[PDB]
Amino acid sequence: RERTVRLQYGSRVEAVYVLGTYLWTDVYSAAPAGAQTFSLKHSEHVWVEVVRDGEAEEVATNGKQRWLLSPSTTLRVTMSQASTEASSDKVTVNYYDEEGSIPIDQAGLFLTAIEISLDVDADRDGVVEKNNPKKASWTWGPEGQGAILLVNCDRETPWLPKEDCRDEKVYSKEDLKDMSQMILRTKGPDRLPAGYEIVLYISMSDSDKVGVFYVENPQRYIHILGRRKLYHVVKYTGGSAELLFFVEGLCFPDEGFSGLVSIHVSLLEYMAQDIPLTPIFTDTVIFRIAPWIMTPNILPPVSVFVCCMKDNYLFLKEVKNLVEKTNCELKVCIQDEIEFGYIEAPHKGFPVVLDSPKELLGPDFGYVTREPLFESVTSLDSFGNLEVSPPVTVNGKTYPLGRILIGSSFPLSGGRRMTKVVRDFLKAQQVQAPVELYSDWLTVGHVDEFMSFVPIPGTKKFLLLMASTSACYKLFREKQKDGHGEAIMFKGLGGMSSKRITINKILSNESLVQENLYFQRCLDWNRDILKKELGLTEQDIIDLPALFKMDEDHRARAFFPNMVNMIVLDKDLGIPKPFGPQVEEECCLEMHVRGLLEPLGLECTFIDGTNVRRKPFTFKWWHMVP
Amino acid sequence: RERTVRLQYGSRVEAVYVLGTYLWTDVYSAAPAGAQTFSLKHSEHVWVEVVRDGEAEEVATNGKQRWLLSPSTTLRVTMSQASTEASSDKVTVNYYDEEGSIPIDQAGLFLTAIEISLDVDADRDGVVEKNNPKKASWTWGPEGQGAILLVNCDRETPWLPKEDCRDEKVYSKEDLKDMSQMILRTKGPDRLPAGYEIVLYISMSDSDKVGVFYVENPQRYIHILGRRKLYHVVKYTGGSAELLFFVEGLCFPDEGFSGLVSIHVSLLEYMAQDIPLTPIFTDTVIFRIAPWIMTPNILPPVSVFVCCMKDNYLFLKEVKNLVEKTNCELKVCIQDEIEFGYIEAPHKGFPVVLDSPKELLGPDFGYVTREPLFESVTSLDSFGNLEVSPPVTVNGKTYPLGRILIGSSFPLSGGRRMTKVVRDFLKAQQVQAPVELYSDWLTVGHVDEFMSFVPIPGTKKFLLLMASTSACYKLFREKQKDGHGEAIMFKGLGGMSSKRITINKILSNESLVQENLYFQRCLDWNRDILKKELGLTEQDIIDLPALFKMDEDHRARAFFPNMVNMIVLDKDLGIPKPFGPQVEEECCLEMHVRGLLEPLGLECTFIDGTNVRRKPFTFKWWHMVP
Ligand SMILES: CCN(CC)C(=O)c1cc(-c2cc(CN3CCN(CCCCc4ccccc4)CC3)cc(C(=O)N[C@H](CC3CCCCC3)C(=O)NC)c2)ccc1F
Ligand SMILES: CCN(CC)C(=O)c1cc(-c2cc(CN3CCN(CCCCc4ccccc4)CC3)cc(C(=O)N[C@H](CC3CCCCC3)C(=O)NC)c2)ccc1F
Ligand SMILES: [Ca+2]
Ligand SMILES: [Ca+2]
Ligand SMILES: [Ca+2]
Ligand SMILES: [Ca+2]
Numbered sequence A, B: 001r002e003r004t005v006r007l008q009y010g011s012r013v014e015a016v017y018v019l020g021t022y023l024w025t026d027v028y029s030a031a032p033a034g035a036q037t038f039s040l041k042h043s044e045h046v047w048v049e050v051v052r053d054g055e056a057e058e059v060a061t062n063g064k065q066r067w068l069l070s071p072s073t074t075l076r077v078t079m080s081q082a083s084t085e086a087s088s089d090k091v092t093v094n095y096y097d098e099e100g101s102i103p104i105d106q107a108g109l110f111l112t113a114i115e116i117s118l119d120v121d122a123d124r125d126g127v128v129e130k131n132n133p134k135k136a137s138w139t140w141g142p143e144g145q146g147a148i149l150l151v152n153c154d155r156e157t158p159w160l161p162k163e164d165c166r167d168e169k170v171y172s173k174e175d176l177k178d179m180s181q182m183i184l185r186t187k188g189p190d191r192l193p194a195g196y197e198i199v200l201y202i203s204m205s206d207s208d209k210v211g212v213f214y215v216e217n218p219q220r221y222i223h224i225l226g227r228r229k230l231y232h233v234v235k236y237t238g239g240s241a242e243l244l245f246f247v248e249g250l251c252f253p254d255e256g257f258s259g260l261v262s263i264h265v266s267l268l269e270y271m272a273q274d275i276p277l278t279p280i281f282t283d284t285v286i287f288r289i290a291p292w293i294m295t296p297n298i299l300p301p302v303s304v305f306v307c308c309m310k311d312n313y314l315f316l317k318e319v320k321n322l323v324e325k326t327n328c329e330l331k332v333c334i335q336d337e338i339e340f341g342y343i344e345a346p347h348k349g350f351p352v353v354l355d356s357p358k359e360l361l362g363p364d365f366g367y368v369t370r371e372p373l374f375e376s377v378t379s380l381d382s383f384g385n386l387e388v389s390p391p392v393t394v395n396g397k398t399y400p401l402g403r404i405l406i407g408s409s410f411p412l413s414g415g416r417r418m419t420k421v422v423r424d425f426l427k428a429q430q431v432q433a434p435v436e437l438y439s440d441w442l443t444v445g446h447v448d449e450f451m452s453f454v455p456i457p458g459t460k461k462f463l464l465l466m467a468s469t470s471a472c473y474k475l476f477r478e479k480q481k482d483g484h485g486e487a488i489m490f491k492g493l494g495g496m497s498s499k500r501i502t503i504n505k506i507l508s509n510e511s512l513v514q515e516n517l518y519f520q521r522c523l524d525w526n527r528d529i530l531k532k533e534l535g536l537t538e539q540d541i542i543d544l545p546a547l548f549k550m551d552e553d554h555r556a557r558a559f560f561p562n563m564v565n566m567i568v569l570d571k572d573l574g575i576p577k578p579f580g581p582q583v584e585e586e587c588c589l590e591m592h593v594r595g596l597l598e599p600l601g602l603e604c605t606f607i608d609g610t611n612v613r614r615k616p617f618t619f620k621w622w623h624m625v626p
């Protein structure tokens, strides 16, 4: 900051100087008519150069020198420490004519130096450092810098019908732990010279994205900037001072919101009561609002939310028994209305649930929805149609939080699609760079019908499980050749089950073969996208046998329990029970799925839906580089 | 592109292969029950590896080998050259049981290889190279790559009431010179196997940003993609073929439009008449739509558009005489409704006029407006409030096309502002990274009232001229001390002029002094922004004397002709005539302005408004790095 302050003909000029800046001071134009030259005195804690065509030259407090008056002779004026005294520091210029050695006129400059700094934790260690030089920018990576702000989308006080950030009020001191600290630090005399004040302010635009709070009697919580509050005039305390504000995020990154917000402080000069003139100093901090992040299946489970809204014991017992052999909780009352994720800042973080188009909205449990407006919901809006990969590297790039996957239709198909308003939210989060797959070939239309990830438990590595109809046909032709043709299929369930569906019955159904050829085609289309977009190879993929029937819409609905659609609890796999053609003790499908999976570390339990909240990534999203 | 194609139990499978891709082919799952092993034959121009847990292995056309059947034993299938024959190329697998040496079943794959490439001039030399590997991306800098598309905002046929891009029709072959070439190149047999076609397509979103044309009888101009045309089915010509399309841009970069657009081609498989299935190959080109670019005063003038809509001869004659001593034209009938700029691509470029909230819309003379909607126009929307710097470097960054400057008010002032819709357009152009100044302290509210750039003609360097009231007062106190106090001011003009305004009269007006102190403050505020944002120093600045009077709104209107508000024609400066206090032959203001400027190369002519179209930058905007 080089800033202009001219001397004024015949006058003394009072100026505030902010430490960190430079004054350039015209002396020429204040000079009386007929002067040819000037000297100057200045005070101890004011540094003063003279400057002609770029050539600097320090000058003594005391010296008696005279120079030639000229528009290209100017001063540069700096100060090193704040004033304890309103003025005291000063620069005084004497002007002189051809003859005499007494000055003909003089002009002066009376400085009050102050320090003003609006400070944030741009280096991201949870401590509000002093005037971080990067605090007005935001960069990615471990070298990156720039403060981080959470959306205050949880709830501290449960009598509130909505989340914290929905009001312009802080009710509990609990709340402030979710907030980001911003410190106005000042250093100067017992007061400001007359005509100055300090204003914090925000833009109209940012006014619905931030809320700023002052804690009085640090007690009451003063809402100073935010909705319908674009500025706030700050009472200066003299001496070395610090004001503490707490900042809450209100809106997630989204369509038309990068997630970056600014807050400013200005030293504003006034002419009277009212009559604002111009700022003489401005300081600015940047915040990025933390994205919502989804949790893939490789990440350790913390709790498993079931909800059979009926009378289940054996679904409750095989899901309870599985959960027990893990660290984690059960949590009864699902997969289609709710997606678990989190938000993190260096100070703080907590789980947030995306709610599909309220209920778990608690302390340290946050909440977002996105609401269509014109576009109608379909089946593809259900969060069974929303999954996320493990960490992957795709051709050099790294995706340390994985990628979101959403089922879709082809763009010129007229098919179903998840609402744009949810699609836009998810891409706007950036850090899980979403991928559209093709799920609309399915009656229901969900990615979780045909793929799943499982961690290989020694690693540190995962596998893509894919449904495969061709795998199924290969298996049946073996069984039937093994003499199990007349072995009956799907004897178990108590609605639509088996009127002697045998393998033979199936294998000789030519119509159903062709449908399943079309479906294998839909599957291979997805396989090619997943391989490309998660940088996978055939090494990384296991095809689980699967069979569909083609409904009236030309869409697949499962023939028997889709086994890829499982609960992944670390090493325990909760895998739907197929009920299929036997050979002895157990099923030849169950034994086949046990065949592929168990030799890798994976411990399959077959269950006759759920949802699992998981540990965050250790990996900090700000260290990424999207 | 690794792409899945399975063999199918007992069947022969016909596939199209696109050169540049890889097939992965499952053999396991097509295998009959009880086989333990497979061999394979394949044709000359089909390369075939076998692959287990990652381990490759080429195989002979001829060989007789057998391998062990297993899900992790698969093939990889490539081809090197296109087919002249529908099929001919092929891969055939034999399956075998424990005993016999005759195959038990077989499965085959019958390939037709074709080459398909959608090509553009992503390397930006005006030639459409062959399958540029970067043609699906857009990058900046001399190393950057990515094709460029002009907005077709000029007019070839003048019977049209609007610009070319306003219809979905090309009337003249002239037009196509403004268009970008995109070449669908194919190489294959006399026809495609049954069930395939080639579709060009665009997104709904891009559909109002691009228009694509086919030239028939290369004759008629076929509009194939664009408004209400999202796809087009292409007739395949056999052999080595090339289809030529011409692409027009329709919309400039803007709020919510990055300026990037995509065009795709897919090979789409069908089941019947209708019944589209899935694409088997897709290719994509990217275009960036060229920004509108403004021309600063250092750039050589080409023509000077005057328009005194009255009876001017001495304004016509001093502007004509000045124009004559330059290369350039006069062009009579201005500065406030029109801004001259251009658009460039590697093939092509032409002047485009931004029209402030039609007339010069010609061949190779284009047109944009932006139209407010809710927001009302003010004086600050006039293009006197729109200027552009010379090339500058600001703290490492380079701005080789300069920066746009717009006068504004303070954001919490309730003051006037140029319409958002024009502000958003200008920033969206990116390459001249606009700067908001403070012009609302002026009655009219234009940046051109208080600053101007002039080229120093030996360089290669420019100067910022600033209006200065303090300079004026310094000058008058000299004159009055020189005994010119009673020398009369502003005797010339024929409306509001002089009832013995003398220097003395002015100097003793204390009220007017204070107003001009406030105005010098407004000026220094701007000075500080310009220094910061154009990386200038005091070396680079000349203050021209100037005086304002404060209207009822607390706003400056010039006291005498604002001399900074000049025509800059290379070395000739067309500088408003002040009419001020004399000493002999000429004015002491005129002689003072001649004093500062002429010693640098600059050749001042004083004129008792205009607009100048200039040469583009030699510098190509795509070599920048915003
Ligand atoms: C260039 C490709 N592309 C751009 C990326 C696509 O978006 C694309 C489009 C579709 C698609 C699918 C369906 C619906 N699906 C639903 C599932 N169905 C299963 C068939 C099952 C048959 C069976 C099998 C085995 C056994 C029994 C039965 C196939 C069709 C209908 C339509 C449709 O009619 N579109 C037209 C316009 C079209 C323009 C582009 C060219 C094609 C026309 C239209 O609406 N006009 C206004 C289009 C499919 C694949 C694609 F890649
Ligand atoms: C923190 C600074 N800031 C944020 C970046 C600003 O945007 C800012 C604002 C103004 C500004 C100016 C005017 C208009 N200008 C017009 C020109 N005028 C010349 C005075 C001429 C006097 C004279 C001289 C010499 C001789 C004779 C007369 C000054 C005022 C009116 C108002 C106004 O009344 N605003 C309030 C709200 C405000 C919130 C912030 C703090 C200030 C109040 C309001 O509308 N409430 C709802 C505000 C000026 C400078 C600034 F930097
Ligand atoms: Ca810190
Ligand atoms: Ca709150
Ligand atoms: Ca809270
Ligand atoms: Ca909390």
Ligand SMILES: [Ca+2]
Pocket (backbone or CB within 6 Å): A335, A339, A383, A384, A385, A386, A387
């Ligand atoms: Ca899910």
Ligand SMILES: [Ca+2]
Pocket (backbone or CB within 6 Å): B121, B122, B123, B124, B125, B126, B127, B128, B129
């Ligand atoms: Ca080229």
Ligand SMILES: [Ca+2]
Pocket (backbone or CB within 6 Å): B164, B165, B166, B167, B168, B169, B170, B171
């Ligand atoms: Ca046209």
Ligand SMILES: [Ca+2]
Pocket (backbone or CB within 6 Å): B152, B153, B154, B155, B156, B164, B174, B175, B176, B178
């Ligand atoms: Ca044209």
Ligand SMILES: [Ca+2]
Pocket (backbone or CB within 6 Å): B154, B155, B156, B174, B175, B177, B178, B350, B363, B364, B365
């Ligand atoms: Ca043209």
Ligand SMILES: [Ca+2]
Pocket (backbone or CB within 6 Å): B335, B339, B383, B384, B385, B386, B387
């Ligand atoms: Ca202009």
